[PDB]
DNA sequence: TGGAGAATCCCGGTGCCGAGGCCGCTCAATTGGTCGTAGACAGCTCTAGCACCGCTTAAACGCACGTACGCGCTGTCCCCCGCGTTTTAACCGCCAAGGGGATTACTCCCTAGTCTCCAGGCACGTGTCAGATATATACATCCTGTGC
DNA sequence: GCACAGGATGTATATATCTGACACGTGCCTGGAGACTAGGGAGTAATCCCCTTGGCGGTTAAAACGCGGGGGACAGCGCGTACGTGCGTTTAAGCGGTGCTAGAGCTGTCTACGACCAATTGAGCGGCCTCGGCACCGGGATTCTCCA
């Protein structure tokens, strides 16, 4: 069966930030594993946050708190800011 | 027959190597053993003390005597040995004591030797107090249990002998696993609490205790027969060398322990079993008529 | 010491080093927390001040913080002592703590 | 307010640890290490509290902070 | 309905089987939970707690006491290698530390 | 309020193993927290195992594998033995 | 546009993120705003790491990015290192450095 | 088929290369047996975990994901092989 | 000839600048198979599996040796001894 | 200070396997609509966090003195390191067999979801017993006086 | 000087008194057990072929061994001073009272929202081909070692 990987969107980000650089298959696999791991960390922490307060829904608040608990200072601030911007631009339209 | 002189520690303040091996005239020794027999045959609470002189007849050298390991290590360097604990043949005195316990006359026994020939002779472990210890016994470090083995553990200073405990707890739990440390006290080491307490109780209850094959120079071990006569009771110090408590001795001998004990049993009409391998036994055997 | 004695033959200012051994034996057999609760609680309040003002602390919360910090510092000092012994010494210095943390991964 | 951890306190902590002598410059380093540890644990606990919309730092919040930092703490429920 | 014999009694455990079943179901661990998972998990938890409690009681009896305290649990844990590994990251509150003194720190005897 | 704890079962086990010995309140809390933590660890490992093999359920097999992965030494062997005995007795009933 | 990812200012797959969250056995319900946030955060972190790796590549006279570049980018940035302390990048190597005393004197 | 004492395959120059990567300027002679033992212990741990995962999966081949999962469990997450 | 020690730094720089797998592949695979023989018999490792194992082992050993060098240098030395490895493994909770 | 070299940075030529683009499409993302409830919001209260006081007093703080330790210098020796020749086995290139992983149907048993019944487990009330501190008492050992 | 005997130090045992936590008892209720059904998760058997194991053979890169010298590991010794210990003076921690109220927890009500479903379509994946980045190779110029 066909497998799922984040290769395409990693390519999109790479071209957006470095429009004249490539990436080797090994680096693509490393990035795929890293994205999987970071997503798993954030989602698991969000689920733990929800379970602690007896909630039953992993809402954006849970994700924001999880990303604040996981990433360090500057990384956490930038990630939370980008998440809020994304949600604002989404629900607005 | 490994020596517990360098094994114990380099520090050895014995200060005793000139030991004139006084021997008694045969007639005087006969009279003294006669009076000791007269006293003991009626004395009810009788507890003995065997030192490192009984096994000298076996073959393992003593410590202070002219052939003492420490004495030789002091004057020059010439440690001579003949036998081994594994091949150590019990002396007739061990079987004599076993029989005495069997008939119930020997209330208790508190030895300070290390070969454990008393344990190997079948003396009820519940009746002895191996104050300094015993090679053939390793004690667990967790459950404080004992294991009377058949081959020397081979360690000194209360250290690991390379075996883990094998006593199974209920409810299918993990078996206790402790180092099974050895039992021989290094200089400046405490005594086994249970054995020492039992020895103290027995000695205090002893209205007549006789101390054999020991110079009694050593800690507590040589002090038990002081408290045997304090608060009453008579002390019989049967040894060749001048003991550290002859002035307090209520009796004395200058002769072979084997010979004096043989004369004692002859006067009593008593016989002696004839050694064995490691025929170890723990429960106190029933008293005999 | 009723009739009990170590293995032997028979027969003011403490030497600097023995009182510390007695102290070690004393504190390694006890369990009570080894920091004054009131100053430590004030410290926790001051530390949490920089994050969220007017923050009320449950008594059990301060106790849990104290237990955690005490255990962490005890372990750190154990490792620092091990490092000092490794360096052929007996007095733990700042470098021992720094190396212990560096190996521990926290530094 | 940091100095509330008096030198005898750090000496007692070391004596529990196993130390025999303590260099005179240790105390400042120990205070700094304590400050760093408490800062991290308190930040995690305060984030947990702020998320739950509580003005009080519940004990379970500190327990969860410790568990997050891989220092699970028993005896406080959870 | 017949007499309600709780699952634990049939299994033979002491821990609750239904309680752990509900914890697994509501814990969000899988879309569905097997019929044997709660029994096994309860048995494992009961055995682990039995081990810790038995060792703690051993420590208490060896400390001439009859009320297990956090100190007894700390001693029962840190002195058994497997449990120390399993409980490596815990800090049992009010447990203290094991009485460890490094040999180099001890004094040198054989004076006089 | 209605609080949930394993205190009663822990006391039952204790009185089953140590016929005459109490347990302090703080000690009981420590034991309960230990049980909670071990339960969470085993359950999480079993969940991850069920997810890796693309199975959607948790069974005695997955709990057994989680116990094998987590507990070290003879602890794992004996825990597996007790779990197997428990499940076989239960299934026989 | 039609796709959630397009409606947001993202490039990561919002639909895939939401599907993984729903099927990941995390909670009974999943907020409709969660996927946007999680995808945005993943996109930001990928952008940061790739920016650093590309900078390393350019400083290494290479027109592409290779695991070594990712390793250098991760370890040479303190925040990412703390986030990525317990990771090892296969074929990544080790950051070049030597002690301050082993150098010749 | 029954491999024996292959730990010797980790030769002195190989361990020396590994240490040189770490910034070491001089290596004592006794370091080599110690390093062989340490590597053996680490491999025992990882292989035990991987074999556990594989045997659970009803397979007979230790797929790369088995080793990656074992390393992730041991707090040594590895990137570049999936997961 | 080179005075002793000078080429140690050269080797350090070379082997740190590079990114290959220092240990030989085939002996490492044989070691891994011998180890796995202990747990279950007649396994079949995917080549990627042994590659991942080797990468993990090399990274772990490199980190361990860096810590050991730090320990030895703290001990006022330049030669790393077994005691340094023991200390580093002890302060990190291993063993 | 200076001078010869091993190893290293760097310029030019370049061709293969891997990066990069094309494209059909088929399963997954998207739009719209329905329905139950999980959570937003508002209230009430009364638990417990907070603040303050006065008295006890355990512990903190300042200093003084000395020795035990840290530190540094110097002198073996011995134990690595560097280099050169032997040799040992990795490395690569290719080829074969077949196990075992991967996908596919049929299905059947097991677990989700309900509902009813009710004893197990909780909150509270109560009695009391283990543990802490203080008192007295019996016996070993140490210090000192008297007699041998 | 050693020993006998008494005074003193220090220890373990029997005992008393007290207190707050711990064990048992009780009613109350709701979460768990019994009986039931429906459908889909995953057994199970069959099939296919990808990839692992195994082998061989040649060149040959790195390991192995030996040998010499020189660097530093390690021991010892000596000097300064920093820490340990002790004592007396301070000070603020501990404890027990009250007195207040912020807000933690529970409840009640309702609606906004996620699950689900049907029907639609489009974009991300497998396989297709094309083009070039840099590993590799030739030599030219350069930087710390070592020697002098
Ligand atoms: C640690 O353990 C050791 C052990 O417990 C004893 C060993 O010496 P002791 O038994 O205390 O004294 P010891 O030197 O045996 O004194 C008894 C004297 O008897 C002499 N002796 C040898 N053979 C004898 C026979 N057959 N009959 C009588 N006396 C005999 C000995 O030579 C010695 O003088 O204490 C240490 S410390
Ligand atoms: Zn035992």
Token representation of residue B4 = 């517990």
Asked if E21 contacts E35 with a C-beta cutoff of 8 angstroms, the reply is no
CATH of D1-76, one of 2.30.30.30, 4.10.320.10, 1.10.20.10, 1.10.3210.10: 1.10.20.10
Backbone angles phi, psi at B145, to 5 degrees: -85, 160
Ligand 1 contact, B93 CB (< 6 A):
no
In the block, tokens 């602390």 appear at C57
The three-point CA angle C102-C106-C107 to 5° equals: 45
Token representation of residue B107 = 């209330």
Q: Which residue's alpha carbon is at the smallest distance from atom 22 of ligand 1?
A: B53
Query: Is domain I1-95 classified as CATH 1.10.20.10?
Result: yes
B175 is known to lie in a ligand binding site: no
CATH number for position A54: 1.10.20.10
Asked if B196 contacts B206 with a C-beta cutoff of 8 angstroms, the reply is no
Ligand 1 contact, B53 CB (< 6 A):
yes
**Domain extent for B231:** 1-132+189-289
Query: In H, which residues are within 8 Å of G97 by CB distance?
Result: 23
Strand J contacted by E93 CB (< 7 A)? no
Question: Over the Cα atoms of chain E, what is R_g?
Answer: 21
Question: Distance, in angstroms, between C32 CA and closest chain E CA?
Answer: 7
Q: Which of residues 1-20 of F touch B (CB under 8 A)?
A: 16-17
Distance between the alpha carbon (CA) of I91 and the C1' atom of K68, Å: 40
CATH of G1-105, one of 1.10.20.10, 3.90.1150.10, 3.30.300.10, 3.40.50.300: 1.10.20.10
In the block, tokens 């000139």 appear at B18
Within a 10 A sphere around the Cβ of B39, how many other Cβ atoms? 17
Q: Does C72 touch chain E (CB under 8 A)?
A: yes
Distance CA I15, CA H18 (A): 8
Domain ranges within chain C, ordered by starting residue:
12-107
- Pairing assessment for the beta strands B146-148 and B133-139 based on DSSP bridges: antiparallel
Asked if G18 contacts G3 with a C-beta cutoff of 8 angstroms, the reply is no
B17 is known to lie in a ligand binding site: no
Look at residues A26, A1, A31 and name the one whose alpha carbon lies nearest to residue A14: A31
Distance CA B59, CA B79 (A): 13
Instruction: Write a three-state SS string for chain C.
Output: CCCCCCCCCCCCCCCCCHHHHHHHHHHCCCCCCCCCHHHHHHHHHHHHHCCCCCCEECHHHHHHHHHHHHHHHHHHHHHHHHHHHHCCCCEECHHHHHHHHHHHCCC
Window 21-80 of chain H: CB closer than 7 A to strand J: 25-30, 59-61, 63
Token representation of residue I3 = 């005075």
The three-point CA angle B173-B176-B182 to 5° equals: 175
Look at residues B212, C35, B123 and name the one whose alpha carbon lies nearest to residue D4: C35
Look at residues A33, I29, A37, I58 and name the one whose alpha carbon lies nearest to residue H81: A33
The β-bridge partners of B139 are B146, B181
Ligand 1 contact, B61 CB (< 6 A):
no
Resolution of this entry, Å? 3.1
- CA count, 13 A, side-chain hemisphere, G39: 29
Question: Which ranges of chain B does DSSP label H, i.e. alpha helix?
Answer: 26-42, 54-58, 69-74, 92-102, 117-120, 193-205, 224-229, 257-268
Question: Distance, in angstroms, between D12 CA and closest chain A CA?
Answer: 34
> What is the dotted CATH code of the domain comprising C12-107?
1.10.20.10
Asked if G71 contacts G49 with a C-beta cutoff of 8 angstroms, the reply is no
Question: Distance, in angstroms, between D68 CA and closest chain E CA?
Answer: 11
Backbone angles phi, psi at B197, to 5 degrees: -65, -45
Distance CA I30, CA B164 (A): 34
CA dihedral A76, E91, E106, B112 (to 10 degrees): -160
Look at residues A51, G11, C39 and name the one whose alpha carbon lies nearest to residue D1: C39
> What is the dotted CATH code of the domain comprising H1-81?
1.10.20.10
Number of domains in chain A: 1
Distance CA D9, CA D7 (A): 5
Ligand 1 contact, B112 CB (< 6 A):
yes
Token representation of residue E102 = 């490094």
Q: Which method, experimentally, gave rise to this model?
A: cryo-EM
Decide if G87 and H77 are in contact by the 8 Å CB cutoff. Answer: yes
Distance CA C80, CA C96 (A): 5
Number of domains in chain B: 2
Rounded alpha-carbon distances, angstroms, from residue F42 to B234, C33, E26, E42:
70, 32, 15, 11
Interruptions in chain C after residues (C–N over 2.5 Å): 11
Q: b/e per residue, B221-230, with b = 16+ CB within 10 A?
A: bbbbbbbbbe
Choice from B56, B211, B249, B255 to test ligand 1 binding pocket (greatest atom count within 8 A of CB):
B56
D44-48: Cβ within 8 A, 24+ apart: D44/A69, D44/D68, D44/D69, D45/C48, D45/C61, D45/C65, D46/C48, D46/C51, D46/C52, D46/C55, D47/A65, D47/A68, D47/A69, D48/A49, D48/A52, D48/A69
Chain A residues within 8 Å of chain D (Cβ atoms): 49, 52-53, 61, 65, 68-69
Look at residues E5, E42, E2 and name the one whose alpha carbon lies nearest to residue E22: E42
Distance CA I12, CA H22 (A): 8
Which residue of B7, B133, B218 is the best one to mutate when testing the C interface, meaning the one whose CB has the most C CBs within 10 A?
B218
Residue of G nearest to E29 (CA): G25
Strand J contacted by C1 CB (< 7 A)? yes
DSSP string for residues in H12-51: HHHHHHHHHHTT-SEE-TTHHHHHHHHHHHHHHHHHHHHH
Sign, Cα dihedral of G28, G34, G40, G45: negative
Ligand 1 contact, B199 CB (< 6 A):
no
Element (H, E) at F30: helix F25-52
Is B132 among the residues known to form the active site?
A: yes
Query: In E, which residues are within 8 Å of G27 by CB distance?
Result: 28
Strand J contacted by C42 CB (< 7 A)? no
Token representation of residue H68 = 């990656």
Look at residues B88, B37, B92 and name the one whose alpha carbon lies nearest to residue B272: B92
Distance CA B103, CA C36 (A): 67
**Domain extent for F78:** 1-93
Q: Does H29 touch chain G (CB under 8 A)?
A: no
Look at residues B138, B48, B63, B134 and name the one whose alpha carbon lies nearest to residue B94: B48
Q: Which CATH class is domain E1-112?
A: mainly alpha
Q: Find the ligand nearest to B138 CA.
A: 2
Token representation of residue B208 = 């007549």
Distance CA I48, CA I45 (A): 8
The three-point CA angle C33-C36-C37 to 5° equals: 80
Q: Which residue's alpha carbon is at the smallest distance from atom 13 of ligand 1?
A: B214
How far does residue B218's CA lie from ligand 1's centre (Å)? 10
Say which of B49, B94, B118, B132 is annotated catalytic: B132
Within a 10 A sphere around the Cβ of B195, how many other Cβ atoms? 18
Q: Tell me the residue length of chain D.
A: 78
Asked if B216 contacts B245 with a C-beta cutoff of 8 angstroms, the reply is yes
Asked if H79 contacts A33 with a C-beta cutoff of 8 angstroms, the reply is yes
Distance CA D50, CA D40 (A): 15
Look at residues F72, F51, F50 and name the one whose alpha carbon lies nearest to residue F63: F50
Distance CA B188, CA B11 (A): 10
Distance CA C79, CA C73 (A): 10
The β-bridge partners of E33 are F58
């Amino acid at each position: 069966t066909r497998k799922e990987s984040y290769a395409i969107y990693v390519y999109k980000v790479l071209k957006q930030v470095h429009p004249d650089t490539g990436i080797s298959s090994k680096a693509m696999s490393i990035m795929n594993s890293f994205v999987n791991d970071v997503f798993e960390r954030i989602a698991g922490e969000a689920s733990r946050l929800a379970h602690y307060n007896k909630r039953s829904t992993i809402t954006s608040r849970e994700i924001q708190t999880a990303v604040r608990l996981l990433l360090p200072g500057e990384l956490a601030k930038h990630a939370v800011s980008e998440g809020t911007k994304a949600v604002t631009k989404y629900t607005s339209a | 027959s490994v020596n517990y002189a360098a094994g114990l520690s380099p520090y050895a303040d014995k200060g005793k190597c000139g030991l004139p091996e006084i021997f008694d005239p045969p007639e005087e020794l006969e009279r003294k053993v006669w009076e000791l027999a007269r006293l003991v045959w009626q004395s009810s609470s009788v507890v003995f003390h065997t030192g490192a002189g009984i096994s000298t007849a076996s073959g393992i050298p003593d410590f202070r005597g002219p052939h003492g390991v420490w004495t030789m290590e002091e004057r020059g360097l010439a440690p001579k040995f003949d036998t081994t604990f594994e091949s150590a043949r019990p002396t007739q005195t061990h079987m004599a004591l076993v029989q005495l316990e069997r008939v119930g006359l020997l209330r208790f026994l508190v030895s300070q030797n290390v070969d454990g020939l008393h344990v190997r002779s079948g003396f009820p472990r519940d009746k002895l107090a191996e104050l300094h210890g015993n090679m053939f016994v390793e004690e667990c470090a967790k459950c404080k249990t004992q294991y009377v083995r058949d081959t020397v553990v081979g360690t000194m200073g209360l250290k690991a002998t390379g075996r883990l405990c094998t006593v199974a707890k209920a409810r299918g739990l993990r078996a206790c696993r402790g180092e099974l440390r050895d039992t021989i006290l290094d200089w400046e080491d405490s005594l086994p609490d249970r054995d020492l307490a039992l020895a103290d109780e027995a000695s205090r209850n002893a209205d007549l205790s006789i101390t054999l094959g020991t110079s009694l120079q050593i800690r507590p071990s040589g002090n038990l027969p002081l408290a045997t006569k304090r608060r009453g009771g008579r002390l019989v110090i049967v040894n060749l060398q001048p003991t550290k408590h002859d002035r307090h001795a209520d009796l004395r001998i200058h002769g072979y322990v084997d010979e004096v004990m043989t004369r004692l049993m002859k006067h009593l009409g008593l016989e002696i079993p004839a050694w064995d391998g490691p025929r170890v036994l723990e429960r106190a055997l029933p008293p005999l008529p | 010491t009723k009739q009990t004695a170590r293995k032997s033959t028979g027969g003011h200012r403490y030497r600097p080093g023995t009182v510390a051994l007695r102290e070690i034996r004393r504190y390694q057999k006890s369990t009570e927390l080894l920091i004054r609760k009131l100053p430590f609680q004030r410290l926790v309040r001051e530390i949490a001040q920089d994050f969220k003002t007017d923050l009320r602390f449950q008594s059990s919360a301060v106790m849990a913080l104290q237990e955690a910090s005490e255990a962490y510092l005890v372990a750190l000092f154990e490792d620092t002592n091990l490092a000092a012994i490794h360096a052929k010494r007996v007095t733990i210095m700042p470098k021992d703590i720094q190396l212990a943390r560096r190996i521990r991964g926290e530094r | 307010n940091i100095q509330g951890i008096t030198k005898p306190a750090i000496r007692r902590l070391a004596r529990r640890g196993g130390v025999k002598r303590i260099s005179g410059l240790i105390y400042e380093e120990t205070r700094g290490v304590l400050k760093v540890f408490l800062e991290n644990v308190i930040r995690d606990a305060v984030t947990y509290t702020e998320h739950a919309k509580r003005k009080t730092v519940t004990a379970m919040d500190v327990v969860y902070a410790l568990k997050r930092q891989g220092r699970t703490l028993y005896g406080f429920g959870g | 309905r017949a007499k309600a014999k709780t699952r634990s009694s049939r299994a033979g455990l002491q821990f609750p089987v239904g309680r752990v079943h509900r914890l697994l179901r509501k814990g969000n661990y899988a879309e569905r939970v097997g019929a044997g998972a709660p029994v096994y998990l309860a048995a494992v938890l009961e055995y682990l707690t039995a081990e810790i409690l038995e060792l703690a009681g051993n420590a208490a009896r060896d400390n001439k006491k009859t009320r297990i305290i956090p100190r007894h649990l700390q001693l029962a844990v840190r002195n058994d290698e497997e449990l120390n590994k399993l409980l490596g990251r815990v800090t049992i509150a009010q447990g203290g530390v094991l009485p460890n003194i490094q040999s180099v720190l001890l004094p040198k005897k054989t004076e006089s």
